[PDB]
Amino acid sequence: MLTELEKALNSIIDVYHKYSLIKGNFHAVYRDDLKKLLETESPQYIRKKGADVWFKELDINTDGAVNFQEFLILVIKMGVAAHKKSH
Amino acid sequence: MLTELEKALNSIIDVYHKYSLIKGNFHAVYRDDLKKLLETESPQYIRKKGADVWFKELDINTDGAVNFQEFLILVIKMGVAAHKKSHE
Amino acid sequence: KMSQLERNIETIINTFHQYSVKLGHPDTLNQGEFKELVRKDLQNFLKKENKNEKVIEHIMEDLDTNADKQLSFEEFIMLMARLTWASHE
Amino acid sequence: KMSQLERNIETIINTFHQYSVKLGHPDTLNQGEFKELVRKDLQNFLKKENKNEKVIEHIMEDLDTNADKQLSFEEFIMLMARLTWASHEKMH
Ligand SMILES: [Ca+2]
Ligand SMILES: [Ca+2]
Ligand SMILES: [Ca+2]
Ligand SMILES: [Ca+2]
Ligand SMILES: [Ca+2]
Ligand SMILES: [Ca+2]
Ligand SMILES: [Ca+2]
Ligand SMILES: [Ca+2]
Ligand SMILES: [Cl-]
Ligand SMILES: [Cl-]
């Protein structure tokens, strides 16, 4: 039995895969995939930055994709911002 | 015998350790430490961005420190930029 | 209406808070709070580490980047990302 | 005058170039070039992985984010960061 916190962490991987499996490399989220991700998964205060700004910020190696470790930057920022909001 | 490439990767860890040891938590580089790292370790085209601009970019969790995994972002960007230069 | 990603982040925030609020600064984890959370809510992910209290203390010390003997949410989330990465790998 | 970090980066770049230029596009690694680089220059850091050609193949596939069957330097450097992290972690 995984705890609820542990299941939450595994679910973060599932969310990435929903998008990384759309096309091309299954370990890559491309710019249009990332736009769908932000629209579907993130609140307005994250979306309003814009998918192009977010893509440039997350694509650390400038290879035209967001890999899982790069996606974790977005998760960290969303968690920190959500935590701020909740109080 | 580590290869020259492997020794270069381990040396990158040593560079970070040089600066994280200056003060405070020994797994953290703070604003002034990073300024000193950029000034000593990085070329002008990297430095010119500004140490505060780099710090804001590297501090992903906004806890006021740059940890080793955050430092790796700088190393990737430096690598990509130097590679571009080496054939330009 | 909450997305899957939002639910997972809420789970993280609410778990942090369950412990942070019990004692001391209500929005940070002191050492006893961090230990309790890791012991219960990361009993599988940190199964080996939980066998040694000093290992857990060292984990906290590493995460405590402003050296105040407490983990803010900012500090703590770096652990959650490391653990997700480790699970992924 | 070159810093410690700059020398380490130059070592990475020169090693990538050594193999990328052997065949095909001179600034990317094709599968055979990548295999050669891993077998020789990462014989310690990827010791277990090297024992299976198909594992080395999968690592390149995962790194090849635009799926053109070669690794640009941008794609390759992500392996370098991952291996540096792994080495940092095991010196705990
Ligand atoms: Ca994909
Ligand atoms: Ca990328
Ligand atoms: Ca320090
Ligand atoms: Ca940080
Ligand atoms: Ca508390
Ligand atoms: Ca703290
Ligand atoms: Ca080539
Ligand atoms: Ca490619
Ligand atoms: Cl594609
Ligand atoms: Cl301090």
Distances (CA, A) of D67 to A63, D80, D81: 11, 19, 20
Contact B61, C72 (CB under 8 A): no
| Side-chain-side CA neighbours of residue A49 (13 Å) | 18
Contact D78, A67 (CB under 8 A): yes
Which contiguous run of DSSP H or E holds residue D71? strand D70-71
What is the C-alpha separation between A37 and A31, in angstroms, rounded? Answer: 10
SS3 sequence of chain B: CCCHHHHHHHHHHHHHHHHHCCCCCCCCECHHHHHHHHHHHCCHHHHCCCHHHHHHHHCCCCCCCECHHHHHHHHHHHHHHHHHHHCC
Count other C-beta atoms under 10 Å from residue D40's C-beta.
14
Distances (CA, A) of A67 to A50, A72, D33: 19, 9, 23
Contact C75, C63 (CB under 8 A): yes
Experimental method: X-ray
Report residue B36 CA to chain centroid gap.
10
Identify the domain containing residue B5 by its residue range: 1-88
> Domain segments of chain C: what residues?
1-89
Q: Which residue type occupies C46? A: L
Contact D75, D65 (CB under 8 A): yes
End-to-end CA distance of chain D: 32
Token pair for residue C55? 């290992």
Residues of chain D with Cβ-Cβ distance to B13 below 8 Å are 84, 87-88, 91
In units of Å, what resolution does this entry have? Answer: 1.8
Q: What is the CATH number of the domain that holds A82?
A: 1.10.238.10
> A52 a known binding residue?
no
Count other C-beta atoms under 10 Å from residue B55's C-beta.
21
| C64 at B interface, C-beta within 8 A | yes
DSSP letter assigned to residue A29: B
A-to-B residue pairs, Cβ atoms closer than 8 angstroms: 12
**D1-92 falls under which CATH superfamily?**
EF-hand (1.10.238.10)
> A27 a known binding residue?
yes
Total number of domains constituting chain A: 1
Contact D2, B82 (CB under 8 A): no
Correct CATH for C1-89 of 2.30.30.280, 3.30.420.40, 3.40.630.10, 1.10.238.10:
1.10.238.10
Q: CA geometry: angle at A11 spanning C19 and C50, to 5°?
A: 45
Instruction: Say which of A72, A82, A86 has its CB closest to residue C85.
Output: A72
SS3 sequence of chain C: CCCHHHHHHHHHHHHHHHHHCCCCCCCCECHHHHHHHHHHHCCCCCCCHHHCHHHHHHHHHHHCCCCCCCECHHHHHHHHHHHHHHHHC
User: What is the three-class DSSP state of D29?
Assistant: strand
User: What is the three-class DSSP state of D51?
Assistant: coil
What is the C-alpha separation between D92 and D80, in angstroms, rounded? Answer: 19
Residue of B nearest to A83 (CA): B61
| Side-chain-side CA neighbours of residue B26 (13 Å) | 7
State the nearest Cα–Cα gap between A50 and chain D, in angstroms. 23
| D68 at A interface, C-beta within 8 A | no
What is the C-alpha separation between D7 and D14, in angstroms, rounded? Answer: 10
Nearest to B67 by CA among D40, D88, D47: D88
Contact C70, C61 (CB under 8 A): no
Count other C-beta atoms under 10 Å from residue B49's C-beta.
13
Contact D81, B72 (CB under 8 A): yes
Question: Which value, to the nearest 10 degrees, does the dihedral of the CA atoms of residues C11, C17, C22, C23 take?
Answer: 150
Handedness of CA C64, C65, C67, C71 (dihedral sign): negative
Place of tokens 């500004």: B50
The DSSP string of A33-75 is HHHHHHHHHS-HHHHTT-HHHHHHHH-TT-SSSB-HHHHHHHH
